[PDB]
């Protein structure tokens, strides 16, 4: 049947339909801070989101996506471990049913309440579809979310969730500025990996920010009211839509800081 996060179609079953689930550069991974290699040659990250143009927000039955107009260099990522310019196409979240779980990557085994993924594709390849055929086709910016004070720049997303409660629904979502989701510091860890949901393609250069952002309990609660199911089907709350840590194998995690 279709993949998901339930006992019968969850992460442990994915390999039957996507053999790459057992590949050599799968994500997410646990970030062991004492084994990460400080690399002084790593350049600072360059996030240029001033001309970003959001279009829609959609519930796809797994998570919700905020999609951006990527027809021009409006919101791009460059610098850091990257060569070339990467265009923002969408961002989504992974969260848990409880505050002690929800993130995909863990730091020294610690799980955060959620994890934000800002997906970008290498412009050298023309479109997203071509990008996913290359080892360096994608760049994902990962931001941990912890429960504390409210993130003002997240409320606009929180407010629209009502209208896209079920699988397949979408709503126009223009003029959203993704800079309001960024932490103060841009220090990060980086390693080569993959998408964390099928097709689990190994085309991603992961950039995980060290500093997490805080969101209120009320903000995260609203994410948990979403539905995995389509309307007219038995209610199945969209929670725990995260994949467990995968073996690091022959990879090294590099830190941009000491
Ligand atoms: Hg690839
Ligand atoms: Zn993700």
Nearest ligand to residue 200 Cα: 1
- Ligand 1 ion: Cβ-proximal residues, 5 Å cutoff: 201, 203
Please tell me the class of the 1-258 domain.
alpha beta
- Is residue 199 within 8 Å of 17, Cβ to Cβ? no
- How many angstroms is it from 171 CA to the middle of ligand 2? 20
β partners of residue 159: none
- Residue list for the binding site for Zn(2+): 92, 94, 117
How was this structure determined? It was done by X-ray
Q: Binding site: what residues are annotated?
A: 92, 94, 117, 196-197
Active site residues: 62
CB neighbours of 41 closer than 8 A, spacing ≥ 6?
none
Q: Burial of 81 by CB count in 10 Å (0-12 exposed, 13-18 middle, 19+ buried)?
A: buried
State how far the Cα of 200 lies from the Cα of 11, in Å rounded to an integer. 11
Instruction: Transcribe 170-217 into DSSP letters.
Output: EEE--S--GGGG--S---EEEEEE--SSTT--S-EEEEEESSPEEE-H
Nearest Cα neighbor of 144 from 77, 212, 87, 86 is: 212
Q: Helix, strand, coil % (nearest 5) of the chain?
A: 15, 30, 55
DSSP 136: T
SS3 label, residue 21: helix
Sequence-separated contacts (24+) of 8-13 with Cβ below 8 Å: 11/243, 11/244
In contact, 229 and 4? CB cutoff 8 Å: no
Which ligand has its closest atom nearest to the C-alpha of 119? 2
Using only C-alpha atoms, the chain has a radius of gyration, in whole angstroms, of 17
Contacts of 177 (CB under 8 A, 6+ apart): 49, 52, 153
d(CA 31, CA 118): 19
What secondary structure letter does DSSP report for 244? P
Q: Which residues, at least 6 apart from 226, have a Cβ–Cβ distance to it below 8 Å? A: 59, 64, 161, 164, 165, 237, 238
Please tell me the distance between residue 245's alpha carbon and the centre of ligand 2 in angstroms: 13
Rounded Cα distance, 206 and 27, in Å = 9
Q: Which residue has the tokens 């071509």?
A: 130
The pairing of strands 188-193 and 45-48 is: unpaired
Collapsing DSSP to helix, strand or coil, 139 comes out as strand
Q: Write out the two tokens for 246.
A: 């995968």
Q: Where are the domains of the chain?
A: 1-258
Closest CA to 206 of 18, 9, 30, 65: 30
Between the CA of 63 and the centroid of ligand 2 the distance, in Å, is 8
Distance 27 CA to ligand 2 centre (A): 10
H helices present in the chain, as ranges: 14-17, 128-131, 155-160, 217-223
For the CA atoms of 88, 37, 144, 85, the dihedral, rounded to the nearest 10 degrees, stands at -10
Ligand at shortest distance from the CA of 206: 2
- Report the binding-site residues for substrate: 196-197
Kindly report the length of the chain: 258
End-to-end CA distance of the chain: 46
Neighbours of 44 (CB within 10 A): 11
CA 26 to ligand 1 centroid distance, Å? 11
Q: How far apart are CA 3 and CA 60, in angstroms?
A: 12
């Amino acid at each position: 049947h279709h993949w998901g996060y339930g006992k019968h179609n969850g992460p442990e079953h994915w390999h039957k339909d996507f053999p790459i689930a057992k590949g050599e550069r799968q994500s997410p991974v646990d970030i062991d801070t004492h084994t990460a290699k400080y690399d002084p040659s790593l350049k600072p990250l360059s996030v240029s989101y001033d001309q970003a143009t959001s279009l829609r927000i959609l519930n796809n039955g797994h998570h919700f996506n905020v999609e951006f107009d990527d027809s021009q260099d409006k919101a791009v990522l460059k610098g850091g471990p990257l060569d070339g310019t990467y265009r923002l196409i969408q961002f989504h979240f992974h969260w848990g049913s409880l505050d002690g779980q929800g993130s995909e990557h863990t730091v020294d085994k610690k799980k955060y309440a959620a994890e934000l993924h800002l997906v970008h594709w290498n412009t050298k390849y023309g479109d997203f579809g071509k990008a996913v055929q290359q080892p360096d086709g994608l760049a994902v910016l990962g931001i941990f979310l912890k429960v504390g004070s409210a993130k003002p720049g997240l409320q606009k997303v929180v407010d629209v969730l009502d209208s896209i409660k079920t699988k397949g629904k979408s709503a126009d979502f223009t003029n959203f500025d993704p800079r309001g989701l960024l932490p103060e510091s841009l220090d990060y860890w980086t390693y080569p990996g993959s998408l964390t949901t099928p097709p689990l393609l190994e085309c991603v250069t992961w950039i995980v920010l060290k500093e997490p952002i805080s969101v209120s309990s009320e903000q995260v609660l609203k994410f948990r009211k979403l539905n995995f199911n389509g309307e007219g089907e038995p209610e199945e709350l969209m929670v725990d839509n995260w994949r467990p840590a995968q073996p690091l194998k022959n990879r090294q995690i590099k830190a941009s800081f000491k």
